[PDB]
């Protein structure tokens, strides 16, 4: 018995008392059934036989049959596919399988689906018609659901928006849909709605729900005319009042609302919904759903009003839109962030259309009332959670998402402040006012969220102001709302508040609007004691301490003049924070300078130094002390670097680098032009230890930077006397110079040439020799792409400066005369972007030995250009310039010499794309 063999195999596989080889036989048997060309035939019999065979078995038969069907062709295996269908369709009309294990229904669903996918359009024209004919006659709901889970299996194989597409799957799937649309779609939909209604009244939501499942799935490829009917709308909407059905009902309607129909058509459905919503004056997922529903409509109505076209429908549209306003709010102001965000699009799409419509800025009392209602909501939603604390956590806390929902909300505010500024101001002012006031009603422990709100709103309230017209008027001197706020804030006990977030914010507000204190200076003393407060620069919070430093600086920088009487004290307070304890950390198993510096608030601590510098240099502290203090900071960092480098084998690299960087930013703290000084003597004492510091261990590319960088802003202070010693740096620096640093040296001299244009020259001619010797070599040899690009562009630029800075003549000196020729030639060789610079260069040398020869030699470069757009112009630009300096011979040498080596030369000598074409 071919069947009995299958049953013994399967049964062998499930009996756990069977040996491994025996079981092997079975398993191997069952497996063959899928590959062999005879096997599947066996199964075609077994499966339809209920009383003799067990589900255990049939299932495996059904499974093998599917895999067979799935792999067959319509032409090669057509006869076969049909033999099966008839046997399955017969096994289905039976209606005896639903009473068996659910895996045999599901197993069948799958085959039926697969079978359908291959012969339905042409070979199985009565698929749907026959399935529906069965339901009306059997009256067994279990079958109605079967039929539905099928229309659902079919729909799964037919559409998707996934990226894994295939031109074949799309075309095959497209044909099935196209086939369903023209042949059975209209009845499927009619039959579905029918039982949906029926079962609906049967208070039998078990099926009514599968209908909704399908509806929403098939909505995409369902014919529009079939989905516009209202009775079906009125039906789905009624399900809303029902619990098991309402989530299905709401998701399905949203689907119908998104169906991309024509403007004239969408508005009719949207009215059925709109009307139904109007006359209907909780759970969370429901609300997330209803919200999505509303959001969907809203975004539709609004998208439609933009390209309007009747005159009536134009109205209708705006009316439906209006009636959704109470809902847009009712959900925007929801307690659950998820429900609120469900409506942001619509809100956004809407305020954008409103911004366009505020053409006359005439506000109707309804727009007014609406926009207020909207802010009530946008505001409520910007506040931290009153019943929920916050975390310092930077990577996995929900804050990032909160700060996002804030970033959006703020934009809404902006757009509303755009739509109407008075309304925003008045509102935002009250808003900030009360919260603060209310905050006064709460212990500091529960008052922060509220204060944090007000300080945030304040902070963003006025992010685009730059001049006096912002804080106070010009004639009346009446202060804008902004400052009334700032006055208030400044006069609050916000400073005394211990919550970090509030301190930070406060200090940010104080800095963003520092210019304000130039009008109302009173708070100055209180504000500085604050920045130097145990909440300011000494704040314990690992997240605010570093920020405060930056900020302190920024504040001290904007109110430099106002703090000259606070100089002594404040400096004293910064002593501890000027210390350095850099410890090295590291995803990668290894440490580095970068990883180490980041793991420490050094980049922020530099600002602290630069600030001491401002304090010392602008605090009218007598020069007798300002020399004492500056000397005390400089030698303190210097003495530490010396002590370390003076006793141990060369984590001091980091310590040197940073000690280097310290001095550098300390320099930045001081003024850039050096009328006598006392901080000048100290700076001289400074580079001796740096040269002491470079020559001892000046191997790291980083110290290279730090030290180079140090001169850049050190010699910027008292630059005249320093230009003389830079020569020694070029030597030590150019000795160990690598491909990457030779460029940073040109820039160093280049940026340097700008500062001391007149007096840098004599030391320049010394460098050019050692520099150019290094350059020609580096340009002639894992870093090829690196050096080439970096050296190509720096050599190009350095020559340019030297020419305009008036350094040419200096390069004719003894040391340069040996290189003049190659430097000039090499420019010719250099000759898109690079070519452009080189031609400007050759023009620089020209306009500003071998000079005449190089001039002629430029001539061939103009004809050599087309052998390969702006280059072409700058080319005939140098050529145009050529004539002027050489005059009468220049053209005379081109007529006699070049022309000879008749119409192009004619036209040319008179004044390329033509010569090229």
Count residues near Ca ion (CB under 5 A): 1
CB-nearer residue toward Ca ion: 337 or 529: 337
Of 64, 144, 57, 135, which Cα lies nearest the Cα of 101?
57
CB-nearer residue toward Ca ion: 124 or 205: 205
Please give the structure tokens belonging to residue 881. Answer: 């310039």
CB of residue 449 vs Ca ion: minimum separation in angstroms? 10
Residue nearest to Ca ion (CB): 337
Long-range (24+ apart) CB contacts under 8 A made by 408-411 are 408/344, 408/348, 409/378, 409/381, 409/382, 410/382, 410/460, 411/348
CB of residue 687 vs Ca ion: minimum separation in angstroms? 56
Residues 536, 511: Cα–Cα separation, whole Å: 13
CB-nearer residue toward Ca ion: 387 or 910: 387
CB-nearer residue toward Ca ion: 134 or 454: 454
CB of residue 337 vs Ca ion: minimum separation in angstroms? 4
CB-nearer residue toward Ca ion: 230 or 337: 337
CB of residue 389 vs Ca ion: minimum separation in angstroms? 13
Strand residues in 751-871 grouped as ranges (E): none
CB of residue 387 vs Ca ion: minimum separation in angstroms? 11
CB of residue 226 vs Ca ion: minimum separation in angstroms? 24
Instruction: Concatenate the DSSP letters of all residues of 139-164 into one string.
Output: --HHHHHHHHHHHHHHHHHH----S-
CB neighbours of 749 closer than 8 A, spacing ≥ 6?
760, 764, 767, 798
CB 765 within 8 A of CB 810: yes
Would you call 479 helix, strand, or coil by DSSP? Answer: strand
CB-nearer residue toward Ca ion: 58 or 292: 292
CB-nearer residue toward Ca ion: 340 or 711: 340
CB-nearer residue toward Ca ion: 187 or 337: 337
Binding mask 212-251 for Ca ion (x = CB under 5 A): ----------------------------------------
CB of residue 169 vs Ca ion: minimum separation in angstroms? 25
Which range, of 177-185, 222-230, 330-338, 423-431, touches Ca ion by CB under 5 A? 330-338
Which range, of 19-27, 93-101, 220-228, 336-344, touches Ca ion by CB under 5 A? 336-344
Q: How many CA atoms lie within 13 A of 620 on its CB side?
A: 7
CB-nearer residue toward Ca ion: 379 or 419: 379
CB-nearer residue toward Ca ion: 450 or 717: 450
Which range, of 177-185, 329-337, 436-444, 751-759, touches Ca ion by CB under 5 A? 329-337
CB 214 within 8 A of CB 152: yes
CB of residue 100 vs Ca ion: minimum separation in angstroms? 30
CB neighbours of 303 closer than 8 A, spacing ≥ 6?
349
CB-nearer residue toward Ca ion: 337 or 741: 337
Which bin fits 600, alpha (ψ -120 to 50), beta or left (φ > 0)?
A: beta
CB-nearer residue toward Ca ion: 501 or 749: 501
CB 578 within 8 A of CB 634: no
CB-nearer residue toward Ca ion: 406 or 805: 406
Residue 409 CB: number of other CB atoms within 10 A?
19
Which range, of 283-291, 335-343, 442-450, 781-789, touches Ca ion by CB under 5 A? 335-343
Burial label, 814 (beta-carbon count in 10 A; 0-12, 13-18, 19+): exposed
CB of residue 292 vs Ca ion: minimum separation in angstroms? 10
Please give the structure tokens belonging to residue 819. Answer: 């290189």
CB neighbours of 333 closer than 8 A, spacing ≥ 6?
340, 376, 377, 380, 381
Residue list 579-638, contact with Ca ion (CB under 5 A): none
CB of residue 601 vs Ca ion: minimum separation in angstroms? 30
Report the chain's C-alpha Rg in angstroms: 41
CB-nearer residue toward Ca ion: 398 or 529: 398
CB-nearer residue toward Ca ion: 292 or 844: 292
Helix (H) or strand (E) holding 328: helix 325-332
Contact call for residue 399 and Ca ion (CB under 5 A):
no
CB of residue 289 vs Ca ion: minimum separation in angstroms? 8
CB of residue 383 vs Ca ion: minimum separation in angstroms? 8
Which range, of 332-340, 411-419, 583-591, 710-718, touches Ca ion by CB under 5 A? 332-340
Residues 876, 646: Cα–Cα separation, whole Å: 62
Interface residue with Ca ion, options 45, 178, 194, 337 (CB under 5 A): 337
The angle formed by the CA atoms of residues 325, 329 and 334, to the nearest 5 degrees, is 155
CB of residue 158 vs Ca ion: minimum separation in angstroms? 19
Which bin fits 259, alpha (ψ -120 to 50), beta or left (φ > 0)?
A: beta
CB 684 within 8 A of CB 729: no
Which range, of 284-292, 337-345, 390-398, 668-676, touches Ca ion by CB under 5 A? 337-345
Residue list 160-179, contact with Ca ion (CB under 5 A): none
CB of residue 454 vs Ca ion: minimum separation in angstroms? 17
CB-nearer residue toward Ca ion: 176 or 454: 454
Of 501, 560, 496, 506, which Cα lies nearest the Cα of 534?
496
CB of residue 240 vs Ca ion: minimum separation in angstroms? 16
CB 383 within 8 A of CB 453: yes
The angle formed by the CA atoms of residues 33, 37 and 40, to the nearest 5 degrees, is 45
CB-nearer residue toward Ca ion: 407 or 829: 407
Helix then strand then coil, % of the chain, to nearest 5: 75, 0, 25
Of 315, 319, 321, 278, which Cα lies nearest the Cα of 301?
321
Long-range (24+ apart) CB contacts under 8 A made by 885-891 are 885/846, 885/847, 886/855, 890/855
CB of residue 508 vs Ca ion: minimum separation in angstroms? 21
CB of residue 144 vs Ca ion: minimum separation in angstroms? 22
CB-nearer residue toward Ca ion: 160 or 337: 337
CB of residue 397 vs Ca ion: minimum separation in angstroms? 13
The torsion angles phi and psi of 472, rounded to 5 degrees, stand at: -135, 155
Residue list 680-699, contact with Ca ion (CB under 5 A): none
Residues 108, 376: Cα–Cα separation, whole Å: 56
Residues 305, 321: Cα–Cα separation, whole Å: 10
Is the torsion defined by CA of 854, 858, 859, 861 positive or negative?
positive
Binding mask 128-167 for Ca ion (x = CB under 5 A): ----------------------------------------
Which range, of 207-215, 288-296, 333-341, 888-896, touches Ca ion by CB under 5 A? 333-341
Q: Which spans of this chain sit near Ca ion (rule: CB under 5 A)?
A: 337
């Amino acid at each position: 018995m071919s069947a009995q063999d299958v049953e013994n195999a399967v049964e062998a596989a499930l009996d756990p008392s069977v040996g491994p080889i025996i079981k092997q036989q079975a398993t191997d048997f069952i497996g063959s059934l899928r590959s062999s060309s005879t096997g599947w035939k066996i199964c075609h019999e077994i499966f339809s036989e209920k009383t003799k065979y067990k589900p255990s078995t049939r299932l495996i038969c059904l499974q093998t049959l599917s895999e067979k069907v799935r792999e067959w062709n319509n032409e090669s295996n057509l006869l076969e596919l049909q033999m099966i269908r008839d046997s399955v369709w017969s096994y289905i009309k039976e209606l005896s399988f639903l009473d068996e294990p659910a895996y045999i229904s599901n197993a069948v669903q799958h085959l039926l689906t697969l079978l359908f996918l291959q012969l339905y359009p042409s070979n199985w024209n009565d698929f749907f018609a026959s399935l529906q004919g069965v339901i009306a006659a059997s009256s067994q709901s279990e079958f109605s659901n079967f039929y539905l889970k099928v229309l659902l299996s079919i729909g799964d194989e037919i559409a998707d928006s996934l990226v894994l597409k295939t031109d074949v799957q799309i075309q095959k799937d497209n044909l099935v849909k196209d086939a369903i649309r023209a042949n059975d779609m209209s009845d499927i939909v009619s039959f579905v709605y029918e039982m949906m209604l029926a079962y609906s009244n049967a208070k039998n939501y078990g099926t009514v729900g599968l209908c909704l499942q399908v509806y929403a799935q098939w909505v995409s490829w369902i014919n529009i005319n079939l989905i516009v009917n209202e009775p079906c709308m009125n039906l789905l909407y009624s399900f809303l009042q029902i619990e098991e059905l309402r989530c299905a009902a709401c998701e399905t309607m949203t689907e119908i609302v998104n169906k991309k129909m024509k403007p004239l058509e969408k508005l009719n459905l949207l009215n059925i919904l709109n009307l139904n919503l109007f006359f209907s004056k909780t759970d969370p997922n429901f609300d997330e759903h209803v919200a999505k529903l509303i959001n969907a409509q809203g975004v539709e109505l609004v998208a439609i009003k933009s390209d309007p076209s009747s005159p009536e429908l134009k109205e209708n549209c705006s009316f439906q839109l209006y009636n959704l306003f109470p809902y847009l709010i009712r959900y925007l102001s929801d307690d659950y962030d998820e429900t609120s965000t469900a409506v942001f699009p619509f809100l956004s799409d809407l305020l954008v259309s409103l911004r366009k419509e505020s053409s006359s800025k005439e506000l109707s009392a309804s727009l007014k009332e609406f926009l207020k209602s909207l802010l009530e909501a946008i505001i409520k939603k910007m506040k931290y959670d009153e019943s929920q604390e916050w975390d310092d956590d930077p990577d996995s806390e929900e804050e990032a998402e909160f700060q996002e929902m804030r970033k959006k909300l703020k934009i809404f505010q902006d757009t509303i402040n755009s739509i109407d500024s008075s309304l925003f101001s008045s509102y935002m002012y009250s808003a900030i006012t009360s919260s603060l006031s209310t905050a006064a009603t709460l212990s500091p422990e529960n008052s922060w969220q509220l204060i944090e709100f007000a300080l945030y709103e304040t902070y963003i309230f006025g992010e685009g102001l730059r001049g006096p017209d912002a804080f106070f008027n010009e004639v009346d001197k009446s202060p804008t709302v902004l400052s009334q706020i700032l006055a208030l804030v400044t006069t609050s006990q916000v400073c005394r508040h211990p919550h970090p977030l509030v301190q930070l914010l406060y200090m940010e507000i104080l800095v963003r609007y520092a210019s304000f204190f130039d009008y109302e200076s009173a708070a100055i003393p209180a504000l500085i004691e604050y920045f130097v407060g145990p909440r300011g620069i000494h704040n314990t919070n690992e997240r605010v301490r570093p920020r405060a430093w930056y900020l302190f600086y920024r504040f001290v920088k904007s109110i430099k003049k106002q703090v000259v009487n606070y100089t002594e004290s404040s400096l004293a307070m910064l002593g501890d924070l000027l210390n350095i304890s850099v410890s090295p950390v590291t995803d990668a198993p290894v440490p580095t300078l970068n990883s180490s510096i980041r793991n420490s608030d050094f980049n922020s601590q530099l600002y602290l130094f630069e600030t001491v510098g401002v304090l010392i240099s602008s605090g009218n502290l007598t020069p007798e002390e300002q020399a004492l203090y500056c000397d005390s900071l400089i030698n303190a960092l210097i003495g530490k670097a010396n002590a370390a480098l003076s006793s141990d084998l060369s984590e001091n690299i980091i310590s040197v680098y940073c000690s280097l960087m310290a001095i550098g930013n300390f320099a930045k703290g001081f003024p850039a032009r050096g009328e006598e000084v006392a901080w000048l003597a100290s700076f001289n004492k400074a580079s001796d230890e740096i040269f002491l510091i470079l020559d001892r261990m000046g191997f790291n590319e980083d110290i290279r930077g730090a030290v180079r960088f140090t001169s850049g802003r050190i010699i910027n202070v008292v630059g005249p006397d320093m230009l003389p010693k830079v020569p020694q740096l070029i030597s030590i620096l150019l000795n160990s110079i690598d491909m990457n640093e030779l460029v940073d040296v040109l820039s160093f001299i280049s940026q340097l040439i700008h500062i001391y244009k007149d007096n840098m020259m004599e030391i320049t001619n010394r460098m050019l020799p050692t520099l150019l010797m290094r350059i020609f070599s580096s340009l002639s040899a894992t870093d090829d792409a690196v050096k080439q690009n970096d050296l190509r562009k720096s050599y190009i630029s350095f020559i340019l400066q030297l020419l305009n800075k008036g350094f040419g003549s200096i390069l004719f000196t003894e040391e340069n005369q040996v290189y003049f020729d190659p430097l000039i030639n090499s420019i010719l060789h250099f000759a898109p972007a690079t070519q452009k610079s080189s031609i400007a260069l050759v023009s620089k040398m020209v306009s500003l030995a071998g000079f005449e020869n190089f001039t002629l030699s430029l001539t061939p470069l103009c004809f050599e250009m087309p052998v390969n757009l702006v280059v072409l112009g700058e080319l005939a630009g140098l050529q145009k310039i050529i004539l002027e300096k050489l005059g009468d011979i220049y053209k005379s040498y081109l007529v006699t010499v070049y022309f000879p080596t008749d119409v192009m030369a004619s036209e040319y000598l008179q004044a390329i794309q033509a010569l090229k074409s």
